[PDB]
């Protein structure tokens, strides 16, 4: 099957690179587009420069 | 009849028996999972 990209509820568009999946030990290569909600990464999975992790909230919280 | 009075009705200590205090009652707390629906991870050793 196909599988969507992760932003942990932080984007509606994403892109892909094979080498990510290739070098992932054949596991994953999805990556956000407009990786929103003060998040960042291929999974919109970390707070960008200036911010930190609201540890109280889950990995996909809007804040 | 009445344990508050002795064999000859002499006034003696009558006491509620020993019971758990917290049984079937309400408690106000600070917070709880599920609002918003939340996750939680559990590790197990082997």
Q: How was this structure determined?
A: X-ray
Residues in chain B: 46
Q: Which residue do the tokens 């990209």 mark?
A: A5
Give phi and psi for B30, each to the nearest 5: -90, -50
CA dist., res. A10 & res. A8, Å (int): 6
- Three-class SS of residue B11? strand
Query: Contact at 8 Å (CB) between A25 and A62?
Result: no
Resolution in angstroms comes to: 6.0
């Amino acid at each position: 099957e196909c599988v969507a990209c992760n932003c942990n509820l932080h984007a509606r568009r994403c892109r892909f690179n094979m080498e990510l999946y290739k070098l992932s030990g054949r596991k994953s290569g999805g990556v956000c587009l407009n990786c929103r909600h003060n998040t960042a990464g291929r999974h919109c999975h970390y707070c960008k420069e200036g911010f930190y992790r609201d540890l109280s909230k889950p990995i996909s919280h809007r804040k | 009849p009445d344990p508050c009075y002795d064999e000859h009705g002499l006034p003696r200590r009558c006491i509620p028996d020993f019971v758990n205090s917290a049984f079937g009652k309400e408690v106000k707390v600070s917070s709880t999972c599920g609002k918003p629906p939340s996750r939680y991870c559990v590790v197990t050793e082997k």
